[PDB]
Design a protein around this ligand. Structure first.
Ligand code: HEM
Ligand code: HEM
Ligand SMILES: Cc1cc(N)nc(CCc2cncc(CCc3cc(C)cc(N)n3)c2)c1
Ligand SMILES: Cc1cc(N)nc(CCc2cncc(CCc3cc(C)cc(N)n3)c2)c1
Ligand SMILES: C[C@H](O)[C@H](O)[C@H]1CNc2nc(N)[nH]c(=O)c2N1
Ligand SMILES: C[C@H](O)[C@H](O)[C@H]1CNc2nc(N)[nH]c(=O)c2N1
Ligand SMILES: [Zn+2]
Lengths: 403, 405
């Protein structure tokens, strides 16, 4: 019934009762845990989700069971009964979006969940307009390096008509150019989106860090290409506090992590284009982006620069280099005055978040494999913390590529 | 298409489906409503017969004699015995098979590529705590093999109806004392404060150091536990030093060569072996990262970073990470110098990938606990990090069992 959750470093125990609020099943069954998989494969439905969400709204403002609450419940009844769907009021949308971040079990930054700038772009009718809204988002969220978390919510989905979509997986992304030699110049994760941009008429560059254009799609239309004005995209040259040669590698990364391919579900309405951004955790760039073998794969290069025995796993040249790379990322960002959090600082804040949520809701959904950083896992206190995973709504969902 | 979990490796983009999980005859802690996959501890008439029937079938399959006369006769024999004594007994080769099979089946063990190479010492004749001591000494001798470590297990007599258990009170055959201090701190290993205290209560004269080898608390059926001291020539230890940081040897850190779990239950065809200590060789992260750096263990991260002249005042100097790497490097280096088997987390994980491929061929899946397979340092630097894994309970199995006190 109520799962007991232990911290093995401190011996402290809690119980999770938040999890009974889960209405949507996950991948696990008593027979097998699929906790580690990245993704598994009427108008009563929508009405109860809407009721439930409205309740969570009026409760959150301590106006639960009062008049405005009843008359807004009726408003929805009346809208679905007539049109099979309904619309949200701006502040309710502001509630959902925040709450969808709060509920994101794979997110280590949720201490921040309350601080979210929310742009209503539901009055969008063209890719043209989408681009404008996307551009104000980037400008707002960047703030010359003092990054501020934002979301922009484009118009909701609708029965028998195409979705508004952002084809790009993030708003700022580096091209992947499939070379003759079968190698990849640029970022390998983006080979395919790079190819679509080119198919839709973009003139490519030939560098390792070419900011990709956006492919924006308004309902039932071919997507349209838009180039991000290069002065909007803040970038950070990478260099190392003590290693003088690192900078020559000409390595760099963009300041703004902004997801743009995820669906936002609130009270049963679905928002198919609803990009959000906060700030980077250094390990995302220093460990995964630069060090994954199927990414920029810079480990060996760097270790050879460092002059390490590469001929053997037992010298730990991988672990040594990986650390220098992460350090170079932190230093560089801190030097260019651009918000970044290290994995130690981030997981410390996460632990306090678990605590706040414990008092606030009786738990916190959390995905241990995603919350523990890609290096030095057991050196952070999340490593020792048991965690319960489950789906609460409002939620972000993964959605399949629009092509 | 397939009616089974799909399993993807995100580095190579390769796909497999786990069909072995259909074999699982025991439920874990997850439900469709919520995943409890990271809990360390999750919360007989016909029953025995069917577990027994299943294991026998497993044994006859492994010898490619499924359906044969010896097979149905062994089944008949086992039923005859249960429907008479309420229990039954494994043949020698059945025990060797179930033991290897339990190691094969263990989701949390990264070292399973070695599963087929296990020395199984039978000790189901053992009848006193003195004799347990003897068996254990023999085991340690054999497994340590002067540094050239060899996987082994020693099986003591099974649970009986109306007879007490064989038990090794110690969680490991070799562990350091943890002495609770005047000032609240712990000298030694804080993991072992209780067992240390229990040893002194049962008569041990304690030492006063950070690395004192504990004595054994051994419990024959229905008796008080008797205390036994391992002769020091039997416990191989490695003094720790760094390849280049010269001051590291001056810390007087050290570890023992033989990781030997001693408190686990070994379940085979429903029979329960409450005392069946098993050992292999260390992966270097266990010593260098968990034992030496956990805040609730030796906790040497700060001492070392100070020596390294790092900025411990701020997180973003990655002082924790830099020191942790050296400590790990010193573990590897010192074991390698002293000629004691060890495997670094890179090589260990590569070979587990290879173990996954083999098992995919042989059984159609491999139960594995992601959070336990991925090493505590440099996680995504290892191929296991990008491998999805299905976790489920197969039997034969090893289970955690509560302390006997
Ligand atoms: C404010 C600073 C933030 C930090 C430091 C942070 C950190 C992270 C990290 C490290 C991940 C794992 C990323 C990976 O390995 O791919 C993640 C995932 C996630 N974050 Fe946060 N995040 C932040 C803000 C936000 C914001 C503003 C939102 C939404 C408004 C958000 C929603 C999510 C979601 C939905 C995921 C799941 C990723 C997926 O399934 O693709 N995060 N976050
Ligand atoms: C031969 C080299 C071996 C290596 C490198 C190895 C490695 C490991 C590691 C790193 C762990 C995680 C332990 C922890 O984090 O505390 C583990 C757990 C485990 N190992 Fe292995 N192991 C080896 C041999 C064996 C053998 C011979 C057996 C049994 C016959 C075994 C059975 C297990 C079991 C049952 C666990 C789970 C323990 C628990 O849940 O407490 N391993 N192993
Ligand atoms: C196949 C697949 C499934 C899935 N659920 N997510 C993804 C994308 C995962 C992913 C990859 N790179 C980047 C991110 C964004 C990470 C991110 C997001 C935010 C908002 C802040 C921050 N510091 N970091 C997410 C892929
Ligand atoms: C509460 C709890 C539950 C559980 N299942 N295990 C434990 C103890 C886990 C544990 C701690 N230190 C050490 C080990 C064994 C490590 C080990 C064992 C073997 C045989 C080889 C090898 N390389 N390493 C296991 C505690
Ligand atoms: C297969 C495995 O679940 C997958 O590689 C996960 C592991 N943990 C992760 N954790 C984070 N934060 N981000 C990731 O992309 C992943 N990848
Ligand atoms: C909370 C978490 O499940 C727990 O701390 C686990 C994580 N992974 C681990 N993995 C191994 N190999 N050993 C451990 O003790 C742990 N601890
Ligand atoms: Zn699970």
């Amino acid at each position: 019934k109520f799962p007991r959750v232990k911290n093995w470093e401190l011996g402290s125990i809690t119980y999770d009762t938040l999890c009974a609020q889960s209405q949507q099943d996950g991948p696990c069954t008593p027979r097998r845990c699929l906790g580690s998989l990245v993704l598994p494969r009427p108008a009563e439905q929508l009405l109860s989700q809407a009721r439930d969400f409205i309740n969570q709204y009026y409760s959150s403002i301590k106006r639960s069971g009062s008049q405005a609450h009843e008359e807004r419940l009726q408003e929805v009844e009346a809208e679905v009964a007539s049109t099979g769907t309904y619309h949200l009021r701006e502040s309710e949308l502001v509630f959902g979006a925040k709450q969808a971040w709060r509920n994101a079990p794979r997110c280590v930054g949720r201490i921040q969940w309350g601080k979210l700038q929310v742009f209503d772009a539901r009055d969008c009718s063209s890719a043209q307009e989408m681009f404008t809204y996307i551009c104000n988002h980037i400008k707002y969220a960047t703030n010359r390096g003092n990054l501020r978390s934002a979301i922009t919510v484009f118009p909701q989905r609708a029965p028998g008509r195409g979705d508004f979509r952002i084809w790009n997986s993030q708003l700022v992304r580096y091209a992947g150019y499939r070379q003759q030699d079968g190698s990849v110049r640029g970022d390998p994760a983006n080979v395919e989106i790079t190819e679509l941009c080119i198919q839709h008429g973009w003139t490519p560059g030939n560098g390792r860090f070419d900011v990709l254009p956006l492919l924006l799609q308004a309902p039932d239309e071919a997507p349209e290409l838009f180039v991000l004005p290069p002065e909007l995209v803040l970038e950070v040259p990478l260099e190392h506090p003590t290693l003088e040669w690192f900078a020559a590698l000409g390595l760099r990364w963009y300041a703004l992590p902004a997801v743009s391919n995820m669906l936002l579900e609130i009270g049963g309405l679905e928002f198919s284009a609803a990009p959000f951004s906060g700030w980077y955790m250094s390990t995302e760039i220093g460990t995964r982006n630069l060090c994954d073998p199927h990414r920029y794969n810079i480990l060996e290069d760097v270790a050879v620069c460092m002059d390490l025995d590469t001929r053997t796993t037992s010298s730990l040249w991988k672990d040594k280099a990986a650390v220098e790379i992460n350090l170079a990322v932190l230093h560089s960002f801190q030097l260019a005055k651009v918000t970044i959090v290290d994995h130690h600082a981030a997981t410390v804040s996460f632990m306090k978040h678990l605590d706040n949520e414990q008092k606030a809701r009786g738990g916190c959904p959390a995905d241990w494999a995603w919350i523990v950083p890609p290096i030095s896992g057991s050196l952070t206190p999340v490593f020792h913390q048991e965690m319960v995973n489950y789906i609460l709504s409002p939620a972000f969902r993964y959605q399949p590529d629009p092509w």
